[PDB]
Amino acid sequence: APDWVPPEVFDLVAEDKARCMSEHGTTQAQIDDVAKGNLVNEPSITCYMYCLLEAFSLVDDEANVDEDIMLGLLPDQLQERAQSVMGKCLPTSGSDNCNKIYNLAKCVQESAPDVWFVI
Amino acid sequence: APDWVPPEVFDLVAEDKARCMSEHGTTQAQIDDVAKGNLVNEPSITCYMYCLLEAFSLVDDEANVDEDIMLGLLPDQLQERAQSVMGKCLPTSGSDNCNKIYNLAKCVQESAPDVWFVI
Ligand SMILES: CCCCNS(=O)(=O)c1ccccc1
Ligand SMILES: CCCCNS(=O)(=O)c1ccccc1
Ligand SMILES: CCCCNS(=O)(=O)c1ccccc1
């Protein structure tokens, strides 16, 4: 949703978006809420984000973020900002994979809400 | 094991853990191996998982799973996530009891790696 997201990402994620929303019972409404900063800790959205990340190998089976793959997918414009916020927010911590991603999202959104995006 | 697993279960299983590891020649390394995502189809671990399940009355003599009790014993957030996964992955199928549980474990891990834990 933020204006920096490369156009190609909308097509790149389309397959795994459909699959992940089906698996987690996610609605588009929940997703639209996130750029508005209305994220709540509900598995239907938190496990969706986990699902989408895992699909691009941005996280492992334990929801640990691969910083290199994350920076790789991000555009050049955001490398500086994203590296700083990852330093701050990683490694992930939480009770389960979905909570780990919720905790990461909240962490990022505290200083850099426009760096965390969901589609 | 994942961070969500109830503290109580470490003590609750200690008796049957010992008996089940002894029965199936299981080593602690094999058990630890699973958390890492490295579950293999080997009877010393797959029959161990059967054995622990049966101890909690979660499987019968044919490795049919009691979905209701399995789900009921999971903490709230894991119970929600597992309902879907268990809908897909149950009832069990396979050539023997040990393979049935291997197939269940892999099935669960495809969508919900952190849901299927072994101790
Ligand atoms: C780092 C930005 C947060 C990623 N959130 S997301 O899980 O919806 C997602 C969006 C796009 C690709 C993969 C995952
Ligand atoms: C007695 C209370 C502990 C059971 N909780 S459990 O999540 O570890 C669990 C173990 C085995 C199957 C399902 C859930
Ligand atoms: C979601 C259920 C996981 C079952 N895994 S287990 O069979 O090794 C087991 C762990 C603890 C108690 C009984 C069985």
Longest Cα pair distance anywhere in chain B, in angstroms? 34
Resolution expressed in Å: 2.0
Q: Which atom of ligand 2 is nearest to the CA of B9?
A: 3
- Three-state SS at B70: helix
Distance from CA of A45 to the nearest CA of B (A): 11
Identify the residue whose C-alpha is closest to ligand 3 atom 8.
B118
For the record, the structure tokens of B72 come out as 């009921």
Element (H, E) at A35: helix A28-35
Say how far apart CA A119 and CA A75 lie, in whole Å. 16
Task: State the method.
Answer: X-ray
Tell me which residue of B69, B39, B42, B40 sits closest to B54, measured CA to CA: B69
C-alpha torsion angle, residues A71, A76, A78, A81 (rounded to 10) = 80
Cβ of A47 and B81 within 8 Å? yes
Q: Which amino acid is at A36?
A: K
Judged by phi (left if over 0) then psi (alpha if -120 to 50, else beta), residue B37 lies in left
- Three-state SS at A65: strand
Tell me which residue of A64, A63, A61, A38 sits closest to A118, measured CA to CA: A38
In contact, B26 and B45? CB cutoff 8 Å: yes
Q: In the CATH scheme, what is the homologous superfamily, with its name and number, of domain A1-119?
A: Pheromone/general odorant binding protein domain (1.10.238.20)
For the record, the structure tokens of A105 come out as 């999202």
Q: Which ligand is in closest contact with the Cα of A47? A: 1
